[PDB]
Design a protein around this ligand. Sequence first.
Ligand SMILES: Nc1nc2c(ncn2[C@@H]2O[C@H](COP(=O)(O)OP(=O)(O)NP(=O)(O)O)[C@@H](O)[C@H]2O)c(=O)[nH]1
Ligand SMILES: NC[C@@H]1COc2cc(Cl)ccc2O1
Ligand SMILES: [Mg+2]
Ligand SMILES: [Mg+2]
Length: 172
Amino acid sequence: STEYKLVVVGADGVGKSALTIQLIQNHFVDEYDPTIEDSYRKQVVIDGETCLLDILDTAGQEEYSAMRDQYMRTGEGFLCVFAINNTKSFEDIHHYREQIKRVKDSEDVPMVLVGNKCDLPSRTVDTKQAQDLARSYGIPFIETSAKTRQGVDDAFYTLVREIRKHKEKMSK
Ligand SMILES: Nc1nc2c(ncn2[C@@H]2O[C@H](COP(=O)(O)OP(=O)(O)NP(=O)(O)O)[C@@H](O)[C@H]2O)c(=O)[nH]1
Ligand SMILES: NC[C@@H]1COc2cc(Cl)ccc2O1
Ligand SMILES: [Mg+2]
Ligand SMILES: [Mg+2]
């Protein structure tokens, strides 16, 4: 029983909620109901550990940056979601990461870059662009589809492995 606080961040409409609901409830939400904030728990076994995941599913846009600051201080790792057909959402990852680092006063923050909607026929953000940026940041990159469930579990479980690695580091 280790608890892990995961926050799912990203621009409007990239699939934050569809990903999270696939993880928690195992179905795909076809509808677009914009999020205020939602909280979910999931117990899972990852590499033999019993993990309690406390997941925050965030809004695409806040009216209040104090709300953004708060989740950024609370989360232990961040699922940084863009959509592969949304350039601006990819670009926004830079901004999220800079804010998170500021708010935490730290260069070392557990994160996973997620390129969602990989089921779509055309992408405007290429996998190589995204892989190269993740390499730069020293974080994993995973392509996902909440529609088909491709990559959903591996995205969240990878973020847990990154938070474990971080705690291991902050010890030594
Ligand atoms: N084809 C496809 N559509 C998807 C995928 N994920 C989400 N969608 C669709 O994209 C729309 C937005 O999804 P949603 O999960 O609500 O996005 P969000 O990032 O949570 N929006 P918000 O920022 O307002 O909370 C919905 O119509 C949803 O079904 C995906 O992987 N593939
Ligand atoms: N309701 C949002 C606040 C701030 O951020 C949170 C982050 C997590 Cl993982 C859980 C609950 C949280 O509470
Ligand atoms: Mg949402
Ligand atoms: Mg957002």
